């Protein structure tokens, strides 16, 4: 009957079109801040001196980019890991020159996507569900925090964060391979098994349900009209799908339990993305992937090359050409 | 509650290992990430000043200082890509600092041979290495068997602190649902969504 209790009843109401909740009190202002700043910076933002060497990189559509080449460029290397809000910048043009919008978007996005995760817990609690959908969303949240926050922290600069652009993402990937050999890191290998396996199991589970649908339609209408929303009966023969996949490989290698099967669909990509998020987070502190350069040696002592050595020649080509004016000394220790 | 608290401590102890050289002295743990790249910029400042370069006026390729530039707050710092690590306060470089940053006459005149040694092993034992403990950058060859203890301590405890935050999310979601009484699933008799308004 009080004013706060009527506000609490509206915030936690499951009858709103979108659930707000108390995490939405952090989710909606931070993500709409980051969305507003991203759209304005992607369309029209002046070039950013990313490498701190007064060589400004254009990233917006009004400075000659397209959708692929356009980016919100990371902060200046001269800033480093320093906090650069607008009020610490003496003019907005100085803030725009030094890659200020990147720090505003990334910090509001990472706060807002952690609050999106807690909002996913919160609605499940108000709906009487089991809680752990937001644990599955923690795997892309850990990945976003690794490339936007954790890898800047270990390298000591927001300039080494992943650019908010399509071609900036590929620039982030190639320099990471030259400096950390992520392909030879087993945590990226588990991540590739997470997304190759996850899209395998998605196409596998989606095939066997669609293969074993029960006749409820004619040849003229769509097959999806055989399902009614809110029906209690099963819409596909799971015995027929188990008998198919049990004959495709062999019988003992197939889930007859649909609850164990859907748990395996949740676990395989999420654990795979968790591990590759802890690959980026541990290559942030330069615990790099496997180095097998000049490891095969013949009897005289000469180096016999392997495929890791040919991979090393491609790593050498990226690292001698990346940030080509930024280096003054023979080791890229940053 | 403890899983959330011990995850926050694990992230903190990792960055202790990576950044702090007071409670984690660099004579014991090796140089920090910031410390090793300032040791490189210090080494080639000493290398080139012996060859007669006036290192305070030496222009780099971009027009900034090759050896000595200025921080965004105004302090005289080391030039190059190590301008991001200008907050580094190692004990072998603080003897050359005045209030304005690095003192130019103390760099020109009184640089001690222990400082040139200290920066030399810190340059060559940077916290950069592989999982099979090959020292150096990812393009280095297999001769040096080294990964910094700072890199082992930070990476392991960043790995552990994330998964203990996953444990906070698991166990707090479960304990909140087990206390309310629907952690085993939805009651078929009274499903909560069915007794709600149409949602549009």
């Amino acid at each position: 009957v009080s004013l706060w209790e009527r506000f609490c009843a509206w915030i936690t109401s499951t009858e709103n079109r979108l659930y707000i909740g108390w995490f939405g009190c952090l989710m909606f202002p931070t993500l709409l801040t980051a969305t507003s700043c991203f759209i304005i910076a992607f369309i029209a933002a002046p070039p950013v001196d990313i490498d701190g060497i007064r060589e400004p990189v254009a990233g917006s559509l009004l400075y000659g980019n397209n959708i692929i080449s356009g980016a919100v460029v990371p902060s200046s290397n001269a800033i480093g890991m320093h906090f650069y809000p607008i009020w610490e910048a003496a003019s907005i043009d100085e803030w725009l020159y030094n890659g200020g919008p990147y720090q505003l978007i990334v910090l509001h996005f990472l706060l807002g996507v952690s609050a999106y995760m807690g909002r996913e817990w919160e609605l499940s609690y108000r709906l009487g569900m089991r809680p752990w959908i937001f644990v599955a969303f923690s795997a892309p949240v850990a990945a976003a925090s690794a490339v936007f926050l954790v890898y800047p922290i270990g390298q000591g600069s927001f300039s080494d964060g992943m650019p908010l652009g399509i071609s900036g993402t590929f620039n982030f990937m190639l320099v990471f391979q030259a400096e950390h050999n992520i392909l030879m890191h087993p945590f990226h290998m588990a991540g590739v098994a997470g997304v190759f396996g996850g899209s395998l199991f998605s196409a596998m589970h989606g095939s066997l349900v669609t293969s074993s649908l029960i006749r409820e339609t004619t040849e003229n209408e769509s097959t999806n009209y055989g399902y009614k929303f809110g029906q209690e009966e099963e819409t596909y023969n799971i015995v027929a799908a188990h008998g198919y996949f049990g004959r495709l490989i062999f019988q003992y290698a197939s889930f007859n339990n649909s609850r164990a099967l859907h748990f395996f669909l949740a676990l395989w990509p999420v654990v795979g993305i968790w591990i590759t998020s802890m690959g980026i987070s541990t290559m942030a502190f330069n615990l790099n992937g496997f180095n097998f350069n000049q490891s095969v040696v013949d009897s005289q002592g000469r180096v016999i090359n392997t495929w890791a050595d040919i991979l090393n020649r491609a790593n050498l080509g990226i690292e001698v050409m990346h940030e080509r004016n930024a280096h003054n000394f023979p080791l890229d220790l940053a | 509650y403890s899983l959330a608290a011990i995850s926050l401590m694990g992230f903190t102890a990792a960055l202790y290992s990576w950044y702090n050289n007071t409670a984690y002295p660099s004579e014991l743990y090796g140089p920090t990430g910031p410390e090793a790249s300032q040791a490189q910029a210090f080494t080639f400042l000493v290398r080139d000043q012996r060859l007669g370069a006036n290192v305070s006026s030496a222009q780099g390729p971009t027009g900034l200082g090759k050896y000595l530039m200025r921080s965004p707050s105004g302090e005289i710092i080391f030039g190059g890509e190590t301008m991001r690590f200008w907050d580094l306060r190692a004990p072998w470089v603080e003897p050359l600092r005045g209030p304005n940053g690095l003192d130019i006459n103390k760099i020109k005149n009184d640089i001690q041979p222990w400082q040139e040694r200290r920066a030399a092993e810190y340059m060559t034992h940077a916290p950069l290495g592989s999982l099979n403990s090959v020292g150096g950058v990812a393009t280095e060859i297999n001769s040096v068997n080294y990964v910094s203890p700072r890199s082992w301590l930070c990476c392991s405890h960043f790995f552990l602190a994330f998964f203990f935050l996953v444990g906070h999310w698991w166990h707090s979601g479960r304990a909140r649902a087990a206390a309310a009484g629907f952690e085993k699933g939805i009651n078929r008799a009274n499903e909560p969504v069915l007794s709600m308004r149409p949602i549009d």
Partner: peptide, 30 residues
């Protein structure tokens, strides 16, 4: 001039997302 096309395609894509969320066909039982 092509940035006019790039802006219109992105803003036009977000307008489809707006109508897909708030003008969706409501799922109804029976």
């Amino acid at each position: 001039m092509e940035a006019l096309v790039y802006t219109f395609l992105l803003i036009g894509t977000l307008m489809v997302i707006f109508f897909a969320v708030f003008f969706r066909e409501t799922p109804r039982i029976l």
